[PDB]
Design a protein around this ligand. Structure first.
Ligand SMILES: Nc1ncnc2c1ncn2[C@@H]1O[C@H](COP(=O)(O)OP(=O)(O)NP(=O)(O)O)[C@@H](O)[C@H]1O
Ligand SMILES: Nc1ncnc2c1ncn2[C@@H]1O[C@H](COP(=O)(O)OP(=O)(O)NP(=O)(O)O)[C@@H](O)[C@H]1O
Ligand SMILES: Nc1ncnc2c1ncn2[C@@H]1O[C@H](COP(=O)(O)OP(=O)(O)NP(=O)(O)O)[C@@H](O)[C@H]1O
Lengths: 317, 308, 232, 73
DNA sequence: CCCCCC
């Protein structure tokens, strides 16, 4: 019969020390222990006894086939660029962490606004019909640009709907108006990295309240850490923790987590270990005054560089 | 552990109360303390205490298995689970080994996730054995597994069956991962139906890194408890554990080494270090950075484009 | 029983407790395999034909590796002879320091039974250090109490049955001879010789045997191949 | 930043944090939840509640893009 | 007092 060590459970360090000093090495020896008996023997308080009993007695197994069906039903956030959609497997994937690395002024924030617009696209139009959460740390989230992108997306959906000749498309676009799009983008302004960490901690509760959010964007994860943080070890710890928080949020709440990152001197910033954080990595870079998107790391598509551009209509090929 | 009713036959409540009152709380205190003096100052029978100690050591201690019996049982119960990659199989001498922790060390985009996905696809389809993929960094995409299975075979029913064999579990901090591994240990205990044969944990370093750093050593303890869970899964439960680990440069020698430090460097029985070619994207150099049955440092070339 | 000089001639030019200390892939478990082979191979081949007990507190004992080493050590290798040689070998699996202590207290009752088991490999003693040092809290006495009890039981066992204890301690600290002691002082006092392992960039391995009662350092160089350990 | 005395922290826990030189939101959030488990006691479940508590006092307020549209006009 | 950390 298996034995689960208390060091494995998220018990209080002081409570774990007192429980093993009392002699509880494995949690199996506490399931039948009453909370009053536990507190009288170990010496921890009543609340601590109740909490540790809850924790020890607390401890989804979806097969890869069910995961594939989820991936098919949970549509990718279409990027409106055919090349990136092809090399991202249909767009920015849900339940994944994408990292848009690049030099300043290459089009990372334009992509973030485009995705925030494209999440509200209805399901019958290939979208996910969800809200977007924007976490802007660089102070570059321009509302006029996202309004223009929303207008262009609405026109594109109108064109494809009236090419389809379908009443369901018209009904689904009826609530897909500019006011709804701008009311479906929950924007946070994290002034510094402690604000960002606090907002990432509050994101699970916010999304439990807002159950229809499908995208979370961190417009600049390099900015709050490369500035006002002179400790490299602390930066590494905070980045690892925040990366785990973002991936956990994306998978638990069926999201896509975009993370914009700056370039350092060529190579993505925030250390080489941070390259292990995001599931997908897209470097946006300039070649002869023309924009190329490179799929540096992706667990589903081969590395390949494609052509894209920014137009008044938004994020095009 | 502590003394409780039903822990072992022959004990009673008043015995436990007397032992507690005589500064004996646990099994280690019961068996380390002198039986004669506790018997004479406690009122309990000496023979009863001797029998209690004997059954306690019979139950809580690990019997020494003979070398020949162990050898003949692992000559059948072990398995060289082929990775599905010819060159990586030749580097590992035909591939994984059931009963070991295998660590696929590498940098970002080094192929550890792809190696583990090909491993899971080949085990689920080639050997028709269930796989557990403990996704921690989001690397596992069922579309990539489907692509690998389509490369392996073009029968839709076979691909669907192989995908259903691969069981995906998401665990993003150390406590979720430990809960997942302990739940798997309980599941295998109940099962001993197609049981899980490969446990891919991609990546251990993703969930262990937040623990490390600062003035706390419970991060090291949680890392070592994760190591104990992985090694009990590997050896005691007889299934191939393939963890993936990041790679870091030591700030004293400028040499690449597995992450999570010296304490974790001893954890994987086998370790494959994947790195990129200094002079194609698909091609990667695979080194046997650590092994127990093969010379260290052998270089092979693995081309991810050849499968998929 | 057998002497320490014949256990492996190169390390021992001269009831001991010996420690193996070194990073991963430096040959500690392989030196343990070499000692196991020299102790369990028959007198005809050139071994001592004495039983060896191996404690996996770390779960890296590769049975296939030991069988390969044996098959290469014999002049003529056969399945029956390999099974006979492995009948002398014994393995214990310890998952925790409390489990290690209970296994030791039960192992006393088999040491009494087996007179020919002269050598006791314990790989690795430090495997439960970190865990032991967190649930014991900040009190140094509490955190190393169980490993102290294991150390006392180990010294009792090696004194009663005249065992040669080859312990492996994993180097996990840097010390700001790469050796920073971290186990309990009740274990350090037992150690007679400390043998530090290193690898030269990778077939060549360096061992440094320091005798504590004389604080004398001796240097050895050895290689590992399919045969086992061959001392240069 | 904002000191934990006015965040809503309990006085005993404020003293425990101050004993380890923990005073502001930066000092609290910058540590891993396992370090906070060590310093504050409490569980991982019990320290995520506290991390959410401190963040709610020093996290940005939600601002819908329609809110920015209304404010700019 | 070492722990991890490109
Ligand atoms: N309305 C527009 N029409 C055409 N081009 C535009 C428009 N708005 C922006 N651009 C171009 O698109 C790019 C904007 O990139 P941008 O998305 O701001 O990168 P960024 O991530 O914000 N840089 P940084 O803030 O340092 O991370 C520039 O090349 C602009 O010239
Ligand atoms: N279908 C495919 N065909 C060819 N190459 C592929 C394919 N999918 C992925 N790749 C390659 O795999 C690389 C990324 O490998 P991957 O295994 O996801 O990185 P990883 O290091 O294992 N995961 P991480 O922990 O984030 O570093 C890409 O850059 C591609 O070169
Ligand atoms: N057949 C072989 N031929 C050549 N070299 C080998 C062979 N088998 C193992 N080795 C190498 O010899 C060394 C033996 O490893 P090992 O003895 O387990 O190191 P270690 O000190 O035990 N590390 P650890 O297991 O974490 O305690 C490693 O460097 C192996 O790569």
């Amino acid at each position: 019969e298996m034995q689960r060590d208390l060091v494995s459970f998220p018990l209080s360090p002081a409570v774990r020390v007192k429980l093993v000093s009392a002699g509880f090495q494995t949690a199996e020896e506490l399931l039948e222990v009453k909370p009053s008996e536990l507190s009288k023997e170990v010496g921890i308080s009543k609340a601590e006894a109740l909490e540790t009993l809850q924790i020890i007695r607390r401890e989804k197994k979806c097969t890869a086939l069910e995961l594939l069906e989820q991936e098919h039903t949970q549509g990718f956030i279409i990027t409106f660029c055919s090349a990136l959609d092809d090399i991202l497997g249909g767009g920015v994937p849900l339940m994944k962490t994408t990292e848009i690395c690049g030099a300043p002024g290459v089009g990372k924030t334009q992509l973030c606004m485009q995705l925030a617009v494209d999440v509200q696209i209805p399901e019958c139009f290939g979208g996910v019909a969800g809200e977007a959460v924007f976490i802007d740390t660089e102070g570059s989230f321009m509302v006029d640009r996202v309004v223009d992108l929303a207008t262009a997306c609405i026109q594109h959906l109108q064109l494809i709907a009236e090419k389809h000749k379908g009443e369901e498309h018209r009904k689904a676009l009826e609530d897909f108006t500019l006011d709804n799009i701008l009311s479906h983008i929950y924007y946070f302004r994290c002034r510094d990295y402690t604000e960002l960490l606090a907002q990432v901690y509050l994101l699970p509760d916010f999304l439990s309240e807002h159950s229809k959010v499908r995208l979370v964007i961190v417009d600049g994860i390099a900015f709050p850490f490369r500035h006002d943080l002179d400790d490299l070890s602390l930066r590494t710890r905070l980045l690892n923790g925040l990366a785990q928080q973002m991936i956990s949020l994306a998978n638990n709440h069926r999201l896509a987590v975009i993370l914009t990152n700056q370039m350092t001197t060529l190579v993505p910033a925030l250390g080489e270990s941070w390259g292990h954080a995001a599931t997908i990595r897209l470097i946006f870079h300039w070649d002869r005054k023309q924009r190329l998107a490179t799929l540096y790391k992706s667990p589903s598509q081969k590395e390949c560089t494609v052509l894209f551009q920014i137009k008044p209509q938004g994020f095009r090929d | 552990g502590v003394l409780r009713v039903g822990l072992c036959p022959g004990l009673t409540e008043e015995m436990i109360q007397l032992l507690r009152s005589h500064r004996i709380k646990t099994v280690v205190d019961l068996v380390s303390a002198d039986l004669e003096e506790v018997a004479q100052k406690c009122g309990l029978s000496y023979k009863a205490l001797v029998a209690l100690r004997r059954v306690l050591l019979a139950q809580f201690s690990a019997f020494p298995v003979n070398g020949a019996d162990l050898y003949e049982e692992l000559k059948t119960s072990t398995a060289i689970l082929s990775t599905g990659i010819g060159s990586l199989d030749k580097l590992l001498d035909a591939g994984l080994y059931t009963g070991e922790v295998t660590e696929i060390v590498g940098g970002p985009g080094s192929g550890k996730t792809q190696v583990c996905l090909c491993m899971a696809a080949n085990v689920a389809h080639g050997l028709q054995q269930n796989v557990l993929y403990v996704d921690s960094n989001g690397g596992l995409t069922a579309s990539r597994l489907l692509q690998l299975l389509q490369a392996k075979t073009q029968d839709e029913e076979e691909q669907a069956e192989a995908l259903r064999r691969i069981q995906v579990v998401h665990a993003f901090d150390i406590f979720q991962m430990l809960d997942v591994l302990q739940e798997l240990r309980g599941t295998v205990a109940q099962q001993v139906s197609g049981t899980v044969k490969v446990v891919v944990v991609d990546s251990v370093t993703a969930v262990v890194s937040p623990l490390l750093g600062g003035q706390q050593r419970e991060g090291l303890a949680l890392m070592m408890q994760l190591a104990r869970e992985l090694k009990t899964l590997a050896r005691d439960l007889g299934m191939a554990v393939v963890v993936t680990n990041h790679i870091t440069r030591d700030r004293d020698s400028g040499r690449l080494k597995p992450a999570l430090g010296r304490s974790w460097s001893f954890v994987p029985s086998t370790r494959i270090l994947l790195d990129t070619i200094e002079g194609s994207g698909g091609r990667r150099m695979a080194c046997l950075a650590k092994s127990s049955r093969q010379p260290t440092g052998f270089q092979e070339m693995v081309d991810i484009g050849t499968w998929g | 029983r057998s002497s320490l000089k014949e256990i492996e001639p190169n390390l021992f030019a001269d009831g001991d407790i010996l420690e193996f200390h070194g990073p991963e892939g430096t040959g500690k478990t392989e030196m343990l395999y070499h000692l196991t082979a020299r102790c369990i191979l028959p007198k005809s081949e050139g071994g001592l034909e004495v039983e060896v007990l191996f404690i996996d507190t770390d779960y890296h004992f590769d049975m296939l590796r030991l069988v390969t080493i044996l098959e290469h050590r014999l002049s003529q290798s056969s399945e029956e002879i390999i099974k006979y040689c492995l009948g002398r070998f014994f393995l214990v699996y310890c998952s925790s320091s409390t489990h290690l202590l209970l296994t030791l207290y039960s192992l006393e009752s088999m040491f009494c039974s087996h007179p020919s088991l002269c050598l006791l490999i314990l790989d690795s003693l430090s495997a439960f250090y970190w865990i032991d040092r967190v649930n014991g809290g900040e009190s140094v006495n509490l955190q190393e109490s169980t490993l102290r009890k294991c150390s006392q039981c180990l010294e009792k066992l090696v004194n009663d049955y005249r065992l040669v204890l080859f312990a492996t301690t994993q180097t996990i600290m840097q010390k700001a001879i790469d050796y920073r002691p971290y186990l309990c002082k009740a274990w350090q006092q037992l150690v007679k010789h400390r043998m530090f392992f290193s690898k030269q960039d990778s077939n060549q391995f360096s061992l440094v045997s320091r005798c504590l009662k004389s604080n004398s350092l001796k240097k050895h160089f050895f290689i590992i191949g399919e045969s086992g350990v061959e001392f240069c | 930043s904002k000191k934990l005395k006015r965040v809503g922290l309990s006085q005993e826990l404020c003293d425990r944090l101050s004993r380890h030189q923990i005073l502001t939101c930066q000092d609290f959030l910058c540590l891993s939840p396992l370090e906070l488990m060590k310093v504050t006691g409490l569980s991982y479940r019990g320290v995520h509640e506290l991390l959410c508590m401190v963040s709610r006092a020093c996290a940005p307020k939600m601002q819908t893009a329609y809110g920015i549209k209304a404010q700019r006009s």
